[PDB]
Design a protein around this ligand. Structure first.
Ligand SMILES: Cc1nc2ccc(-n3ncnc3[C@@H]3O[C@H](CO)[C@H](O)[C@H](n4cc(-c5cc(F)c(F)c(F)c5)nn4)[C@H]3O)cc2s1
Ligand SMILES: Cc1nc2ccc(-n3ncnc3[C@@H]3O[C@H](CO)[C@H](O)[C@H](n4cc(-c5cc(F)c(F)c(F)c5)nn4)[C@H]3O)cc2s1
Lengths: 138, 137
């Protein structure tokens, strides 16, 4: 039983083969969800499911450095349903993040910020209840 | 061994199976392919491409009912034209894991879940093969 927003510390930074697993439930009339892998006030990887952008559901990914966003990467596969439980797994590899939801591959996001040791927090927020958040090696 | 080569997987694939392949990339290689086959379906296709829009990339996918799915792509590219390599593929309960020259390269979650039905590993494209075997670890 965790609270939201939740900043999961990643004390040593991220490394290849780290698998982060987040379990929770989408709030019944959710509008947005966010996972932010942060390096200080910069966001190495922002993963943002939007339940209604111009009447579509879309996940937007991007990077924030010095208070500026970059080029968005967008994906319409949308495995989240309002009110329903979900398992998100983020696998960190040497060149990208890979995300799977409910054990199914969703997307990949190539590293823009290359200093993986400095990514030391994962911010989890938006319209969810959070049951658990941890990581392991695979 | 001669390429293309089909490595039989007599009891299919199962967690803890390790496959080890040694060969050499041809100096003018364009593509390499490892295909875990179940009939016409390919549970996991591993496809290093040496020149796709002037980049090297590895493309992974699954073919089921004659249709490919969503690709997983890797820019980490451990193969060099002309050079020997070692590929190991470990089957785990949740995914295949692939290491090249003893370094982790990628993982690929299972999409086709009936692993015991995978009967052959096809090895082809721009390589020469010194050996290919499987063991349980
Ligand atoms: C170079 C660029 N200039 C712009 C200008 C505008 C935008 N627009 N237009 C709509 N929304 C955006 C922005 O897109 C970003 C992704 O590219 C972030 O998602 C950004 N954003 C969302 C959130 C957020 C905060 C929360 F508390 C949440 F719970 C939550 F779920 C999301 N914080 N920042 C969002 O405002 C994008 C860009 S890229
Ligand atoms: C839903 C989809 N619609 C498309 C449309 C086009 C493609 N494009 N566009 C370029 N190449 C592709 C295809 O990507 C596939 C993986 O997603 C396979 O690699 C597919 N392919 C390569 C090979 C192959 C055969 C050989 F004998 C080799 F030696 C060898 F090294 C590779 N067999 N099949 C390839 O043609 C992909 C997709 S997925």
């Amino acid at each position: 039983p965790l609270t939201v927003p939740y900043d999961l510390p990643l004390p040593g930074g991220v490394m290849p083969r780290m698998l982060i697993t987040i379990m929770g439930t989408v709030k019944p009339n959710a509008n947005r969800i966010v996972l932010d892998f942060r390096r200080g006030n910069d966001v190495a990887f922002h993963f943002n499911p939007r339940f209604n952008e111009n009447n579509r559901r879309v996940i937007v990914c991007n990077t924030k450095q010095d208070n500026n966003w970059g080029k968005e990467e967008r994906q319409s596969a949308f495995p989240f349903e309002s009110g329903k439980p979900f398992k998100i797994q983020v696998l960190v590899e040497a060149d990208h993040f890979k995300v799977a939801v409910n054990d199914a591959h969703l997307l990949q996001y190539n590293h823009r910020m290359k200093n993986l040791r400095e990514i030391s927090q994962l911010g989890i927020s938006g319209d969810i209840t959070l049951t658990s958040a941890n990581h392991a090696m695979i």
